[model samples]
Target chain A: MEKKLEEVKQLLFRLELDIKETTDSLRNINKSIDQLDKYN
Target chain B: MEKKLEEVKQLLFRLELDIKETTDSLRNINKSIDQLDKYNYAMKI
Candidate 1:
């Protein structure tokens, strides 16, 4: 049971990492959208 | 075992929503790119 819980924690950590990267990318993209909006 | 799984499932669901919203915004930005491209193309012609 302890080993399984450890695995779950690892999985959650990876998931959290993925979410962080994705949110960061979205922030940059949103900035790009503002730049494009100005041109349009 | 069942209770722990249920909690994991809930966490997964929340993570799924975060991803979904991120993708949706990206889709919107992609559409904006298409529109901008068309406008630029038209201006050149």
Candidate 2:
């Protein structure tokens, strides 16, 4: 059906959180790399 | 700090390349997302 399932909802929530964490880590690493590039 | 010593060489090469690609990808995704946010949800769907 078009209705959302609870299991799918939980899975999507976890995926969103995982993406958020990964995006944040990517941002941090990028910042560090930029600093290194600038100073090195 | 012990009897053993560790040296760094190629350990950072992959990370540097990976981070370079990741930074570029994030920039592209953010730009596209910004553009998509201006239109209807169906365009995104």
Candidate 3:
């Protein structure tokens, strides 16, 4: 059970990393939108 | 310990909801970027 908990923790940590990267991509996309908004 | 695992499972479900929301936003946002940028594809996921 203890080892299973450890595995769960690692999986959770990786899930967080995935979320972080997606949001980071979202932010960059927003920046590009703004830049193009002004350009248009 | 068993109950805590259930709680962790619930947390993961909520986290998936967040991922869904972000993906939805990107889909809409991409369309706007498409119209504005026209030929330029300056950003990606």
Candidate 4:
């Protein structure tokens, strides 16, 4: 459990996917904003 | 470093307003999008 560098690596991996999913949400938001932009 | 971690969490928390403002714009845009529908812009197959 108390892994050293391996723990940090695992944490980074998890954070990367978390950030990746954040991008997924971002694209969804952009679609709305971009469409709104189109109307402008 | 732990204090900086708190700073990091606060930064993420800061998105509360960022996303709130985004939704503010989002609602107006969605309204405009619906306005397009007000004229038959979205009823096609």
Candidate 5:
């Protein structure tokens, strides 16, 4: 049980990092859209 | 162990919700870009 719990924790940590990267990517896309809007 | 499992489940649920929202927002932004591109193409023509 303890090993399973540890594994689950590691998976969650990986998921958290993935989400953070996704959030940053979205933010960058949003900025690019804003720039395009300005030019248009 | 049961309580811990329950807590983990709830956290996972919340993370799923957040991920869904973020993806939806990104989709909207992509649509906006597509529209802009179309408008620019029309202007050129």
Candidate 6:
């Protein structure tokens, strides 16, 4: 769903997200995955 | 271009696609317009 993957690849070339911030975002996405499990 | 033309109901329920083919697909699409134009011209005449 991240249509901006191409843009992000360039923007994040040298920089990286703080691990804690990345982990929190992934946790939020996991919640959405659980919500979609029923449709799966 | 088949944006789920849902109104074409009750047709032969299944459509076969030749994934390895393009000329025939385009041929069928063009042929449809050609036939349609023929009918339209006949009506005008």
The reply for model 2, stretches above 4 Å from the true place, is A1-4, B1-45
User: In angstroms, how far off is B34's CA in candidate 4?
Assistant: 1.0
Q: What are the models' TM-scores?
A: 0.49, 0.41, 0.47, 0.40, 0.52, 0.29
Tell me how much of the true interface, by contacts, candidate 2 captures: 0.00
* Candidate 4 CAPRI grade: incorrect
* DockQ leader: 2
Q: Extract clashing residue pairs from model 3.
A: none
- Cα lDDT, model 2, residue A39: 50
Better of 1 and 3 by lDDT: 1
Residue pairs in clash, model 6: none
Poorest stretch of ten by lDDT in candidate 6 chain A:
A11-20
For residues A1-40, write the lDDT of model 4, one tens digit per residue.
3256456556555755665576567666546555655454
Model 2, B1-45: lDDT tens digits are 111111222334555566567557656755665565556456657
Model 2, range A1-32, lDDT digits (tens) per residue? 22444455455557556666766775676566
Look at candidate 3 and tell me the lDDT of residue B38.
Answer: 49
Candidate 6: misplaced stretches above 4 Å?
Answer: A1-40, B1-20
What DockQ do the predictions score, one after another?
0.04, 0.09, 0.04, 0.02, 0.04, 0.02
DockQ of 5: 0.04
Residue A5 of candidate 2: its Cα lDDT? 43
Model 2 global lDDT (CA atoms, 0 to 1): 0.54
* Per-residue C-alpha lDDT of model 4 across residues B1-45, encoded as one tens digit per residue: 355655644665576557666556645655664565555544553
Per-residue lDDT of model 3, residues B1-45, tens digit only:
346645655665576578788666655655664564544444432
Best by TM-score: 5
lDDT (Cα, tens digit) per residue for candidate 6, span A1-40: 2346445444443223343354455556556555655454
